[PDB]
Swiss-Prot record:
Binds to single-stranded DNA (ssDNA). Has a regulatory effect on phage DNA metabolism and transcription of early genes. Keywords: DNA-binding, Early protein, Nucleotide-binding. The chain holds residues 1 to 117 of 160 of the full protein. This is Single-stranded DNA-binding protein. It comes from the Viruses. The keyword DNA-binding applies. One of its GO terms (molecular function) is nucleotide binding.
Length: 117
């Protein structure tokens, strides 16, 4: 089990290269306990650093990762930010997918579903 300072689709090794997603592709399973969040700033946009305890699995490789921080793609970050707006602690378990999309920077969008689904 590798420890990463931030759990992200990139640090898990599961971010597809641009224009490589031609069908729905399962990327990672993420198990989380969220107990805080901080806004982070980068040159070309802000993001939320979720804090707590996270475990991620790269579905294609089987590799397992652990972290105290989580950063999600924008569409999923907004979903989790709502879900943690009214509860002091949130536990979750989700699977993240890439779906083919309109031509953009990457040609794919992110989807998410509960692992229990």
């Amino acid at each position: 089990m590798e420890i990463v300072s931030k759990l992200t689709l990139k640090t898990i090794g599961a971010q597809p290269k641009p224009h490589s997603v031609k069908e729905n592709t399962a990327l990672a399973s993420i198990y989380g306990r969220v107990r805080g969040k901080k806004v982070g700033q980068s040159t070309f946009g802000d993001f939320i650093k979720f804090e707590g305890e996270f475990e991620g699995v790269n579905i294609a490789t089987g590799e397992v990762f652990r972290s105290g921080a989580l950063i999600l793609p924008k569409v999923l970050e907004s979903l989790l930010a709502g879900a943690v707006d009214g509860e002091n602690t949130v536990d979750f378990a989700v699977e993240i997918w890439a779906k083919p999309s309109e031509k953009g920077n990457t040609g794919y969008e992110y989807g998410v579903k509960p692992l229990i689904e």
